């Protein structure tokens, strides 16, 4: 189901907090963030689930890329 928080995998090794935040900015306010640099993943929480919808939809047509490397994004169990 669509949820506020979006799980993110295959992130670069030195990926800055800033960069993961700048992923959902085009679609709304980012309210919270947990990075797992140990598994190269992160979580990102948006104000509205509806922003998290426009998120995944867009990044299903446009590759979600952080500095030349693409990443894999998906909804979560929030």
């Amino acid at each position: 189901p669509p949820s506020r928080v979006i799980h993110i995998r295959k992130l670069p090794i030195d990926v800055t907090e800033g960069e993961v935040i700048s992923l959902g900015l085009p679609f709304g306010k980012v309210t919270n963030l947990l990075m797992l640099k140990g598994k190269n993943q992160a979580f990102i929480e948006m104000n509205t689930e509806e922003a998290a919808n426009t998120m995944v939809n867009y990044y299903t047509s446009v590759t979600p890329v952080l500095r030349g490397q693409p990443i894999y994004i998906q909804f979560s169990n929030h």
């Binding site: 800055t16 907090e17 800033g18 935040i21 900015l25 306010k29 980012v30 309210t31 919270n32 963030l33 947990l34 990075m35």
Partner: peptide, 13 residues
């Protein structure tokens, strides 16, 4: 830490 999240969250917000 949760430190660097929040400061960077705040910069934007």
């Amino acid at each position: 830490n949760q430190l660097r999240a929040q400061x960077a969250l705040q910069x934007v917000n």
